[PDB]
Design a protein around this motif. Structure first.
Motif, PDB file in Angstrom:
ATOM      1  N   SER A 372      14.305  -1.397  49.319  1.00 33.99           N
ATOM      2  CA  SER A 372      15.392  -0.433  49.470  1.00 33.99           C
ATOM      3  C   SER A 372      15.276   0.771  48.536  1.00 33.99           C
ATOM      4  O   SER A 372      14.567   0.724  47.531  1.00 33.99           O
ATOM      5  CB  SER A 372      16.737  -1.129  49.230  1.00 33.99           C
ATOM      6  OG  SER A 372      17.177  -1.823  50.381  1.00 33.99           O
ATOM      7  N   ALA A 373      15.977   1.847  48.882  1.00 29.59           N
ATOM      8  CA  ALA A 373      16.123   2.990  47.987  1.00 29.59           C
ATOM      9  C   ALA A 373      17.145   2.663  46.897  1.00 29.59           C
ATOM     10  O   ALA A 373      18.314   2.410  47.193  1.00 29.59           O
ATOM     11  CB  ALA A 373      16.537   4.233  48.761  1.00 29.59           C
ATOM     12  N   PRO A 374      16.698   2.673  45.627  1.00 31.01           N
ATOM     13  CA  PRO A 374      17.455   2.242  44.445  1.00 31.01           C
ATOM     14  C   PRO A 374      18.846   2.860  44.310  1.00 31.01           C
ATOM     15  O   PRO A 374      19.026   4.047  44.586  1.00 31.01           O
ATOM     16  CB  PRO A 374      16.582   2.713  43.266  1.00 31.01           C
ATOM     17  CG  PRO A 374      15.296   3.210  43.848  1.00 31.01           C
ATOM     18  CD  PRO A 374      15.281   2.903  45.309  1.00 31.01           C
ATOM     19  N   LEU A 375      19.796   2.012  43.753  1.00 27.04           N
ATOM     20  CA  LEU A 375      21.042   2.546  43.206  1.00 27.04           C
ATOM     21  C   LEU A 375      20.929   2.534  41.676  1.00 27.04           C
ATOM     22  O   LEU A 375      20.561   1.534  41.121  1.00 27.04           O
ATOM     23  CB  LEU A 375      22.210   1.706  43.668  1.00 27.04           C
ATOM     24  CG  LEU A 375      23.594   2.223  43.198  1.00 27.04           C
ATOM     25  CD1 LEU A 375      24.697   1.789  44.154  1.00 27.04           C
ATOM     26  CD2 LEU A 375      23.910   1.732  41.819  1.00 27.04           C
ATOM     27  N   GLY A 394      27.330  -5.487  46.188  1.00 30.19           N
ATOM     28  CA  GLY A 394      26.682  -6.761  45.922  1.00 30.19           C
ATOM     29  C   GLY A 394      25.358  -6.625  45.194  1.00 30.19           C
ATOM     30  O   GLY A 394      24.507  -7.514  45.255  1.00 30.19           O
ATOM     31  N   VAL A 475      14.118  -1.729  43.643  1.00 25.17           N
ATOM     32  CA  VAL A 475      14.482  -2.947  42.921  1.00 25.17           C
ATOM     33  C   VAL A 475      14.102  -4.190  43.729  1.00 25.17           C
ATOM     34  O   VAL A 475      14.466  -4.306  44.900  1.00 25.17           O
ATOM     35  CB  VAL A 475      15.994  -2.983  42.604  1.00 25.17           C
ATOM     36  CG1 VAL A 475      16.367  -4.285  41.906  1.00 25.17           C
ATOM     37  CG2 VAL A 475      16.385  -1.783  41.754  1.00 25.17           C
ATOM     38  N   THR A 477      13.967  -8.461  44.241  1.00 26.72           N
ATOM     39  CA  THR A 477      14.487  -9.794  43.915  1.00 26.72           C
ATOM     40  C   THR A 477      13.831 -10.853  44.797  1.00 26.72           C
ATOM     41  O   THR A 477      12.971 -10.532  45.615  1.00 26.72           O
ATOM     42  CB  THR A 477      16.016  -9.880  44.066  1.00 26.72           C
ATOM     43  OG1 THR A 477      16.379  -9.730  45.443  1.00 26.72           O
ATOM     44  CG2 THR A 477      16.702  -8.816  43.220  1.00 26.72           C
ATOM     45  N   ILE A 479      15.072 -12.617  47.200  1.00 24.24           N
ATOM     46  CA  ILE A 479      15.519 -12.632  48.589  1.00 24.24           C
ATOM     47  C   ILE A 479      14.617 -11.792  49.488  1.00 24.24           C
ATOM     48  O   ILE A 479      14.415 -12.156  50.631  1.00 24.24           O
ATOM     49  CB  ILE A 479      16.995 -12.157  48.731  1.00 24.24           C
ATOM     50  CG1 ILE A 479      17.541 -12.459  50.130  1.00 24.24           C
ATOM     51  CG2 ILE A 479      17.144 -10.687  48.403  1.00 24.24           C
ATOM     52  CD1 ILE A 479      17.841 -13.911  50.389  1.00 24.24           C
ATOM     53  N   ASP A 480      14.047 -10.702  48.974  1.00 29.91           N
ATOM     54  CA  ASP A 480      13.162  -9.859  49.782  1.00 29.91           C
ATOM     55  C   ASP A 480      11.776 -10.483  49.947  1.00 29.91           C
ATOM     56  O   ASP A 480      11.111 -10.291  50.970  1.00 29.91           O
ATOM     57  CB  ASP A 480      13.032  -8.462  49.168  1.00 29.91           C
ATOM     58  CG  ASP A 480      14.364  -7.878  48.750  1.00 29.91           C
ATOM     59  OD1 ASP A 480      15.043  -7.269  49.600  1.00 29.91           O
ATOM     60  OD2 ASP A 480      14.727  -8.021  47.565  1.00 29.91           O
TER      61      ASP A 480
ATOM     62  N   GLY B 396      24.135 -11.331  51.544  1.00 29.44           N
ATOM     63  CA  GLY B 396      23.730 -10.933  50.204  1.00 29.44           C
ATOM     64  C   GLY B 396      24.216 -11.766  49.026  1.00 29.44           C
ATOM     65  O   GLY B 396      24.753 -11.218  48.062  1.00 29.44           O
ATOM     66  N   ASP B 398      22.959 -15.235  46.347  1.00 29.63           N
ATOM     67  CA  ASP B 398      21.792 -15.988  45.891  1.00 29.63           C
ATOM     68  C   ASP B 398      21.897 -17.506  46.100  1.00 29.63           C
ATOM     69  O   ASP B 398      20.946 -18.239  45.816  1.00 29.63           O
ATOM     70  CB  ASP B 398      21.543 -15.699  44.411  1.00 29.63           C
ATOM     71  CG  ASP B 398      21.184 -14.250  44.155  1.00 29.63           C
ATOM     72  OD1 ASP B 398      20.904 -13.533  45.134  1.00 29.63           O
ATOM     73  OD2 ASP B 398      21.198 -13.828  42.978  1.00 29.63           O
TER      74      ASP B 398
HETATM   75  C1  LIG Z   1      22.409  -7.664  47.980  1.00 30.36           C
HETATM   76  S1  LIG Z   1      21.574  -8.128  46.543  1.00 30.36           S
HETATM   77  C2  LIG Z   1      22.091  -9.715  46.352  1.00 30.36           C
HETATM   78  C3  LIG Z   1      22.151 -10.390  44.963  1.00 30.36           C
HETATM   79  C4  LIG Z   1      20.826 -10.470  44.160  1.00 30.36           C
HETATM   80  N1  LIG Z   1      20.973 -11.409  43.052  1.00 30.36           N
HETATM   81  C5  LIG Z   1      20.483  -9.084  43.614  1.00 30.36           C
HETATM   82  O1  LIG Z   1      21.113  -8.590  42.639  1.00 30.36           O
HETATM   83  O2  LIG Z   1      19.586  -8.399  44.162  1.00 30.36           O
HETATM   84  C6  LIG Z   1      19.923  -8.440  47.045  1.00 30.36           C
HETATM   85  C7  LIG Z   1      19.301  -7.178  47.632  1.00 30.36           C
HETATM   86  O3  LIG Z   1      19.705  -5.976  46.947  1.00 30.36           O
HETATM   87  C8  LIG Z   1      18.567  -5.279  46.398  1.00 30.36           C
HETATM   88  N2  LIG Z   1      18.959  -4.660  45.105  1.00 30.36           N
HETATM   89  C9  LIG Z   1      19.352  -5.329  44.001  1.00 30.36           C
HETATM   90  N3  LIG Z   1      19.647  -4.441  43.052  1.00 30.36           N
HETATM   91  C10 LIG Z   1      19.599  -3.197  43.624  1.00 30.36           C
HETATM   92  C11 LIG Z   1      19.783  -1.851  43.209  1.00 30.36           C
HETATM   93  N4  LIG Z   1      20.256  -1.543  41.966  1.00 30.36           N
HETATM   94  N5  LIG Z   1      19.513  -0.840  44.076  1.00 30.36           N
HETATM   95  C12 LIG Z   1      19.094  -1.066  45.326  1.00 30.36           C
HETATM   96  N6  LIG Z   1      18.882  -2.288  45.756  1.00 30.36           N
HETATM   97  C13 LIG Z   1      19.112  -3.374  44.978  1.00 30.36           C
HETATM   98  C14 LIG Z   1      17.527  -6.340  46.265  1.00 30.36           C
HETATM   99  O4  LIG Z   1      16.196  -5.798  46.075  1.00 30.36           O
HETATM  100  C15 LIG Z   1      17.749  -7.232  47.486  1.00 30.36           C
HETATM  101  O5  LIG Z   1      17.077  -6.586  48.611  1.00 30.36           O
END
Ligand SMILES: C[S@@+](CC[C@H](N)C(=O)[O-])C[C@H]1O[C@@H](n2cnc3c(N)ncnc32)[C@H](O)[C@@H]1O
Ligand code: HEM
Ligand code: HEM
Ligand SMILES: C[S@@+](CC[C@H](N)C(=O)[O-])C[C@H]1O[C@@H](n2cnc3c(N)ncnc32)[C@H](O)[C@@H]1O
Ligand SMILES: Cc1ncc(COP(=O)(O)O)c(C=O)c1O
Ligand SMILES: *Cc1c(COP(=O)(O)O)cnc(C)c1O
Lengths: 489, 486
Positions: A372-375, A394, A475, A477, A479-480, B396, B398
């Protein structure tokens, strides 16, 4: 204040009868059926023959090992921690309820904190701040109190692990410093007991003794008792590189003064150290130390520390001159209990680059994930609005960035939360205070294996533009990755 | 395959002369000046009097402690790991160069890996996948090899059955089976109990021991009942274990406890509950408390089971008067628990430790019912892992609950667990999700503190709100953070 490296005033000389000694001398003790306290377990340590490692390297001799990790505290210093106290207690120097301050980290402070815990003395151990959690946890558990001194500040400095102990000694009532470097009780403990044990167990016959050198009391007392009662025995001292203790000075030449082996070698020549009773010195490093330590544990079943590995690594060299029928005794200082997370860990051995082992999608590149494109967040917004967004989408974080896109750090939820439990932050103030710098950064061109390692290690890693480390591409994790795998299987 | 809980066929009966015994019997050994190998250091353990803790709790008697952490491996199991092998070696069952497979993650794996390392046997230890790093690092260091088995006692894919599968599949492989092997209680019957009788000059009025497989307490209680009738034997069982008698004591809510090495859901073969005069129920709190108290006051570096033993001892020995003697068994050292009960952070995280320094945030004594959590999304055990990954993708999170069709939740599934299992190749995207079910997880309820919740979310990534057996939902950090910062 008195310097520990101050020249020795001892008049002891080889050939002088034992009747002339002004010191107090104890003897090895017959142990009871029932011990009155745990401190009586200190001493009478077992001598274990080394069957495999000796022959593997081609030793024609017999190689025995004096295991001091079977002491009640799991180190050789339990011998002196007892002695130094038992002397002071006799002298009238040490009173019931007193405070024992020592400028040590881990090997003596444990023995002292144990003896103090048993006998009701307050114990104060003074040391740098980053001390290994094993030793620190043992000390705090025994009831000892720790003083964190600054990591970078000199021996001669007023704010070190030693001078500050003297300042406390002056400031605190009934406080004493036994001073393991200067105290004659240190080498007298091994002179009276250890060397007599070695002579009893070996029937008065051995042709070499190899010992690693720390403060030097052990090797000194032993070498003196031996030189007296067993002339033929040669004494071999072991010194790490970066240490000046070894003679001649030509051996002490090196680039770095820093070594990972704990307990042996520091920059000064202590008072208790007698370098005239050491027949030859050998230079060891951290690699062969830890290698031979792992080898001792694996092959011989001896659970010990890195200093033991140094001792033996030297022994297989020094004992080559020995022929068949002779005997060589080595000193094994301490147990693996302190090094559980250090040389015993493969990850750690890999990190320092000692063993460095080699390493279906494992060699596939992280690029394939297509993340994804970072936040990212400004350092400057509140913690409340922060976890407000991180609750909304989330996501757990930020690369914490400046106005230029430069990474200033990262911030995660749990970090924020523990920062709140401590009460060091509140929703009002800026998030820029909670920046978490201890995460790991890996990126696109990296393998999925290393990423996997980090993912069972941490919650995340951070893809940066390949050749701009201040830039954040995305970013990652677990899950990807699971997305990728479940997708293409 | 043979069941470990299978009833004992031993015809031993109190009063029967020792000449009738069909087993092989050793004796305590005079130790040499120079040990030929480290394995000779096993045994002749010291007996240390407890001076402080005894009197502090008001014991009129003498309290001694049998310290087995001075064994070469730092545990009592070094006694049996030796024996079980030395017997097999004699029997012709065990050959040079053979493989010893044991499904225990306990101290037995350490003792066995040590003896195997010394004598050149390949060692295979089979265990669950969590397995706190200390033990694992000791095993890998001794040369032993580990098999991660994602826990269920009589399951086909467990810590035990798969070891039997390997035993059948691997040439020259043996399973000594510490639960069923007579060498286990015979080790303590022949040696340990004779040491205790020698050191105590044949006189002691009570013995307190924590119960694991049960060989120790069995062999000891038998030798004592024979040669020292007056001695009462006191067994210790954690809560969540059914080992203790009568069955009324074994009534509890949770079957999970943090103390390592004691208590089981089954009654092993080697355990003789007819030689135990009385049983006591201990918990993890008093176990770890008394362990810290032993280390601090007595200078004895030991484990939590020792704390359980002693915590019971100060109760059971109250009947004893002045002039008598009580002996307790201290199983192992603190070396395995360096990052667990020895860590203040950990003790706080689990809620055993005491809270205040006398001031802290107002939401502390608020409770999680105020957090206003929503319905949990439940996963079926029969679902495919890839599907789980899809739903849990889109939502979304874990982690998710694993629940059967009948409504009873058999557990939790976490992404780290699925990933861990996959990296081991023990699960595939098309596999049952029921494989990755994670049975060790932490419970915070509706009415528990936000503080306890906090400590929990410092340990692990979640906990699970329950209205009373029933449930409410699943809680993680961002709801706490959202509530407070609101
Ligand atoms: C929805 S979150 C779910 C909780 C997980 N523990 C986490 O923080 O990533 C998982 C997804 O969000 C993405 N992600 C997590 N932090 C992010 C950030 N700051 N900006 C963009 N994407 C993010 C991850 O790479 C993954 O595709
Ligand atoms: C016949 C035997 C010995 C004699 C006559 C002797 C004599 C002395 C004397 C006269 C001092 C000077 C004390 C002072 O100036 O304040 C001294 C100090 C000392 N001795 Fe001995 N000694 C003997 C054996 C030993 C042995 C065997 C050891 C250790 C194994 C030892 C360790 C020390 C130490 C560490 C000091 C302190 C030196 C200092 O503080 O500068 N001595 N001894
Ligand atoms: C006079 C003394 C004893 C006698 C005559 C005796 C006899 C027996 C017999 C006949 C068996 C049956 C073997 C079989 O069916 O496979 C047995 C099994 C066993 N014995 Fe003993 N025994 C004695 C003492 C002991 C002691 C002191 C211990 C332990 C401390 C012990 C532990 C066991 C165990 C664990 C079994 C295995 C039972 C099973 O596999 O189900 N025995 N004994
Ligand atoms: C969106 S997730 C973000 C990632 C976070 N690490 C997690 O797993 O909770 C956080 C929100 O989802 C909720 N949550 C997590 N797992 C849940 C599930 N299985 N059912 C319902 N809500 C769940 C949390 O309680 C919280 O309100
Ligand atoms: C781990 C360790 N090994 C070896 C030594 C050397 O012992 P000594 O300084 O008494 O000669 C010390 C002290 C030590 O702490
Ligand atoms: C095995 C064990 C026990 C119990 O000993 P048994 O031989 O099963 O009676 C107690 N403490 C620890 C740490 C153990 O591993």
């Amino acid at each position: 204040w008195i310097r520990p490296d101050a020249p020795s005033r001892c008049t002891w000389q080889l050939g002088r009868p034992a009747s002339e000694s002004p010191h107090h001398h104890t003897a090895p003790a017959k142990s009871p059926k029932i011990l009155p306290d745990i401190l009586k377990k200190i001493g009478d340590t077992p001598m274990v023959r080394i069957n495999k490692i000796g022959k593997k390297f081609g030793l024609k001799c017999e190689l025995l090992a004096k295991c001091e990790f079977f002491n009640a505290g799991g180190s050789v210093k339990d011998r002196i921690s007892l002695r130094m106290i038992e002397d002071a207690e006799r002298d009238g120097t040490l009173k019931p309820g007193d405070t024992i301050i020592e400028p040590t980290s881990g090997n003596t402070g444990i023995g002292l904190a144990l003896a103090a815990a048993v006998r009701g003395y307050r114990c104060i151990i003074v040391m740098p701040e980053k001390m290994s959690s094993e030793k620190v946890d043992v000390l705090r558990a025994l009831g000892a109190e720790i003083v964190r001194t600054p990591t970078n500040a000199r021996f001669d400095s007023p704010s070190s692990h030693v001078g500050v102990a003297w300042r406390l000694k002056n400031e605190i009532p009934n406080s004493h410093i036994l001073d393991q470097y200067r105290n004659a009780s240190n080498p007298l403990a091994h002179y009276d007991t250890t060397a007599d044990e070695i002579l009893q167990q070996c029937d008065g016959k051995l042709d070499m003794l190899v010992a690693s050198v720390g403060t030097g009391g052990t090797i000194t007392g032993i070498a003196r008792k031996l030189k007296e009662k067993c002339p033929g025995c040669r004494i071999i001292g072991v010194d790490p590189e970066g240490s000046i203790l070894a003679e001649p000075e030509e051996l002490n030449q090196t680039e770095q003064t820093t070594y990972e082996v704990e307990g042996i070698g520091y920059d000064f020549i202590p008072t208790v150290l007698d370098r005239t009773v050491v027949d030859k010195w050998f230079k060891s490093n951290d690699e062969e130390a830890f290698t031979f330590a792992r080898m001792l544990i694996a092959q011989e079943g001896l659970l010990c520390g890195g200093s033991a590995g140094s001792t033996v690594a030297v022994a297989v060299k020094a004992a080559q001159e020995l022929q068949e029928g002779q005997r060589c005794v080595v000193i094994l200082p301490d147990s693996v209990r302190n090094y559980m997370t250090k040389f015993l860990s493969d990850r750690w051995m890999l990190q320092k680059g000692f063993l460095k082992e080699e390493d279906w999608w494992w060699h596939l590149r992280v690029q394939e994930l297509g993340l994804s494109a970072p936040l990212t967040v400004l350092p400057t917004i509140t913690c409340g609005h922060t976890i407000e967004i991180l609750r909304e989408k989330g996501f757990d974080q930020a690369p914490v960035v400046d106005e230029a896109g430069v990474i200033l750090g990262m911030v995660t939820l749990g970090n924020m939360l523990s920062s709140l439990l401590a009460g060091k932050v509140q929703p009002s103030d800026q998030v820029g205070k909670v920046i978490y710098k201890q995460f790991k950064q890996i990126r696109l061109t990296d393998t999925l294996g290393r990423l996997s390692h980090i993912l069972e290690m941490d919650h995340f890693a951070l893809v940066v533009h390949e050749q701009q480390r201040q830039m954040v591409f995305g970013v990652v994790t677990a899950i990807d990755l699971l997305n990728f795998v479940a997708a293409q299987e």
